[PDB]
Amino acid sequence: VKLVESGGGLVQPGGSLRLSCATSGFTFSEFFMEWVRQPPGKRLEWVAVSRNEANDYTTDYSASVKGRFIVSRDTSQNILYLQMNALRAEDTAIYYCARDAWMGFDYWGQGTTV
Amino acid sequence: IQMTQSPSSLSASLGERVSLTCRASQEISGYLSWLQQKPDGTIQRLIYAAFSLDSGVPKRFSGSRSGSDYSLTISSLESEDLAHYYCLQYASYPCTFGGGTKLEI
Amino acid sequence: DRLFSSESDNSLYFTYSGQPNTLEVRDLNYQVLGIQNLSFKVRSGQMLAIIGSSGCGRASLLDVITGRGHGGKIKSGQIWINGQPSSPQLVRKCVAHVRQHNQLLPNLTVRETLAFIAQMRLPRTFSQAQRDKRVEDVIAELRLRQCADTRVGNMYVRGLSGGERRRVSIGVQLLWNPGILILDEPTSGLDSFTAHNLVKTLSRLAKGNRLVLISLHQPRSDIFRLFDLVLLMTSGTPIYLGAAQHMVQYFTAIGYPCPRYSNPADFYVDLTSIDEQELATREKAQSLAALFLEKVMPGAVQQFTTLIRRQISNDFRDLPTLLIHGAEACLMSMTIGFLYFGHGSIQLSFMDTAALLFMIGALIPFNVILDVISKCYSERAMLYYELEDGLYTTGPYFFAKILGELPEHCAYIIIYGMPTYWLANLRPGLQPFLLHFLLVWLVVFCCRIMALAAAALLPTFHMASFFSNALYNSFYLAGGFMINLSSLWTVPAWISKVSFLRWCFEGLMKIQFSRRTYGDKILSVMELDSYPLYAIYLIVIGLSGGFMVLYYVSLRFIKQKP
Amino acid sequence: PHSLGILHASYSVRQILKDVSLYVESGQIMCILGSSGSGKTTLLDAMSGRLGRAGTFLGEVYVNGRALRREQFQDCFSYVLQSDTLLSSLTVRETLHYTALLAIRRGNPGSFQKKVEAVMAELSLSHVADRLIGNYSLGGISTGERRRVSIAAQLLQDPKVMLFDEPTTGLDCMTANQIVVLLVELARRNRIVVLTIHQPRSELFQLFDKIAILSFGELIFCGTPAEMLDFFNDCGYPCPEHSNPFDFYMDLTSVDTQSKEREIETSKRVQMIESAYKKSAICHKTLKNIERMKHLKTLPMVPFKTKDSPGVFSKLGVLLRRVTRNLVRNKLAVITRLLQNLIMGLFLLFFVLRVRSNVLKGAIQDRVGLLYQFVGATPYTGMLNAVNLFPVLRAVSDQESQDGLYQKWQMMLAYALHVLPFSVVATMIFSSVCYWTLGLHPEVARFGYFSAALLAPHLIGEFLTLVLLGIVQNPNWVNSVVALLSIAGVLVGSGFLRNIQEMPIPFKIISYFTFQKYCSEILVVNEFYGLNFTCGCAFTQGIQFIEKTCPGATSRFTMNFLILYSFIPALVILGIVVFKIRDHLIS
């Protein structure tokens, strides 16, 4: 298992950004895909979840980003995508890419600064 | 479910026995995980279900439970222990994390 | 839909991986209410809710579909499961049934009983890690992680809530990953919010490539709003079959509009409900029925070990029952000891010692019968359901029950026999005391086996208790102390020959009065010198074996219907 | 017209009711909904004046302008329970006639029969007036007919304000709807009806005139169904189409006790709805109507019951005749009552079958065994009869004593009076069949003495079981306790197997309070007196065995008989006291 995050940079408030989470070493179609952010001076906070093929690739977001964030996955390349809209207001964090939340947060990534 | 981790900061010497306390607001029936965020940024799970250990984790880390207080005990602390620790619960939706504990040598 | 809890997780953690299961019923006609021309077809991924008269007497419609039934059995149609004709083997292999009354041990936690059911369900090829993973997936699928360590105790016990009990039952019936799920009144006796959450959980389970069938007599508005497919049954005949949201539009299109501020299910049930008036309302239901038609592993040793472990874990945690048993035993022992107190100036006579031994032998069977019958009838229904599910073939269950009840029986014998031999100042020594202890233990074990056989042979609790009391009285009168064991012509003599109480009395007499008289003359003048001690022990062992054989035959051949 | 007014009602003994304010008039029917812990049953019990002795009840209850005290509730308010405990072996006409005789006292039975006929015609019960109640599943009357019979028995006292505790729970949909229509008609016939329903149907919304909702004792809403819809639409929760407004408004005013946040949310919503209702005009209009009725002085007098209860002897005789007719009309009951001792004696004769009075191998042994079995089996049969036949009468008495008809000790006395002759006849026939066949000292005087000495312990055990059933609810526990007590008595008090002259002091003292000792002494003196023994051998005569077992029993035969026969009224008085405590430890 190996997770690589990318797509962080300097954006203006109200803009748009897309993060990329590369997966390697496991079947991308049977495990979940979770986005976990971390503010510079707060605790870890779960952002969104993208379920496996058994749930028809359904998504779900937290009560703070429901409507502004859009998470998707590409099965051809096993790369997770997180489309962020109306960001940089208070969503600046060190967003990480997790694999499983219901079976314990295991095999974390590297995280990127948004 | 709010996860209160204590203490907020801890400083010890090499070889000392460090114990971190995490308290859950509700009953999770032992569904607790311990994360270790290295200063470089890479996080790695050390103990899942509050009793077992992940692959590649040294046997110095152990998990215990006393009533409603989960404890992560680290014996024979080395120089590779300088990192942040976060306790989380995954028994009730949504999955919440802990306040965190900065362990410095 | 906005008044209920909405902060839940819509994820599916345990789905059915395999070919989609089907269920097709073609012109089902039941006879002894009156199902006529029932026909429907459901596939995996749909939730069929049978509303209205979903029963044909003592057996519901889902019991008829599965092949069960307490009433009649003469069928007139066909039932196709996964493209194959109906058969008990097929419904046992693919179809899962969740009854209305739960069968859960109160002294066990959720995780323990789930692991036990998984060990008795999964084949021997699955390792312990796979069983633990399956149990964790079943727990996470039904959102039972916050109560996985709490006990599942029934009423009069703390345990947990009713909805959590129903979820635990669903998980027990869902551990072996069934393709078709069947529940009879899942929301019976639950709160409104609890029933809504259970219906949402059942819908989520059906969404995971499964086929879930639900029977509900009077569903609420919020419950009817969550139905995927509905089947209206009135007096056995179907009225509507399809989507729940389209039922109102169909009834309005056939000339029966639903009034504003009125539940559709209740209105369409009491509109065609059977009441000179009975024939007038019958043709109305027949007209709608005809109108609807024109528009359309692991092994015996492993099972025995799991059963005995579950029984031990359930018995060693029931503190009140053990406390009452110990209190009764101590009270009986103290009464017997202080009534026949031999220490003092006046010693016990011969007839006093004889009556003391007879009472020691014949007073415990009453409480023994009572306790054994109560314990057997408190789980007869659970045993019948577990046997019908197909976990064990009642072979190892006999030995499991025997070896699980043996420790409590031995403890009870110790408590009943310790403050009894010393208070009465009987024959001093170790060998006579050990012989008396062993004889009392064997006699009480034989009585326990007789009680188990009488409980498994008769379905009624009162009738079984009456039969046990009749046998106990027949064995009591046949003893060698009441009717002298000599005034028996043909029937009482043969009854005494198979009476464990008479053999117990004779053994106690031969133990206490051999070469200890104040000689064998005291037994020569009586009729307790025609069988040696080892012969009495062998006869008691043979009676115990015969009662065990009878109990096994009754368990294997007689159905333990509640 | 009459009018019921409740103002600031509260029941603490843990604040079950909090500021209940209701107002009903004549010709209207008020329904009350609520959750499990809503406290509607407590409100009904406080209105009827039954559970007021357990905890203090505040507030005033105005009826026609006059405030009724805490003692006038049972004289104006009727209460129909949900258990529906009726005698199976009795007709509707006879049951209503007995109820009218216990309630009203006018004179010749013509007026009572006319009243019963009128009440049956009011509820349409003339077609089952000459049919046994029985069981609905065994071929008797249906559950709706039983509820109609109960309502008729309650209306026989001519009430004006009626209360119903869940009259539709336990029935099917059609029967529940019929009961609702019947209650609506009874309310429209110049009466006040206040009933509670667990979960009504959709067609029962427009049938009621006033609908009340209670949540943890707090009044959420009370008004017209149209006003109910208007208020719930103005509050911001419009009822959706095809949503069963009853269930919707029950779920909107409920507390979800599943998590720590949903409970707080539901509590906040309930409090907001209650605060919006307290500021509405409906509660103000209700309070204004209550205050106007309180200070009007134009409404007629408070309508009480028709008459008071008759004397104690008349009620006792009526209850005796009722229980006698109920016992005679049940063939199985009298069959068991008269044949239990017979089957016991036949089972003993199948083993003993004779006593060899010319051999010393088992003669004394057989006699002692027979006497022990008789003394240990007669109270067992009495307890069996009591446990099998009393609990139904006990439930009927518990249900009918709260209405002021009669007391429970009168029912116990009537049960004893009706059980005396049947037990006497059973013991007599059992002795006539078994005493002569066994050949136990054939003589007429000994026969009568044996009959009496086996009849007394039967009645003693039956009355002891009656007392224990009056003090303990569970019949199986009473059965086990009586069995253990009888075993202990026949083992200690009886000098057959213990030789009392050698038993310790505490057991010797305990044996003096047991009837088994006197029974065994009487039986020994009656058996081993006038016959000799031969071994063809401790003893040779019977007087030696008598002096060995009970030395001074020959001179105290009559004293033992007197004590055995005086043990009976003491148990009756103890049962009277037990029932005078039971009628206080339940309510």
Numbering used by the authors:
A (entry chain C): 21 to 134
B (entry chain D): 22 to 126
C (entry chain B): 25 to 56, 86 to 328, 333 to 353, 392 to 613, 626 to 669
D (entry chain A): 35 to 47, 66 to 588, 600 to 650
From the paper:
Thus, the mutations do not interfere with the folding, heterodimerization, or intracellular trafficking of G5G8 to the biliary membrane. Furthermore, we purified G5I529WG8 and G5G8I419E from HEK293 cells and determined their structures at 3.5- and 3.1-Å resolution, respectively. Although the cryo-EM maps of the sterol-like molecule that is attached to the protein surface in the vicinity of residue Phe433 of G8 are similar to the WT protein, no sterol-like density is present in site 1 of G5I529WG8 and G5G8I419E. These results confirm the important roles of G5-I529 and G8-I419 in substrate binding and provide further support for the premise that sterol binding to site 1 is required for sterol transport by G5G8.
Members of the G subfamily of ABC transporters are encoded as hemitransporters and dimerize in order to function. G1 is abundantly expressed in macrophages and exports cellular cholesterol to extracellular acceptors, especially HDL.
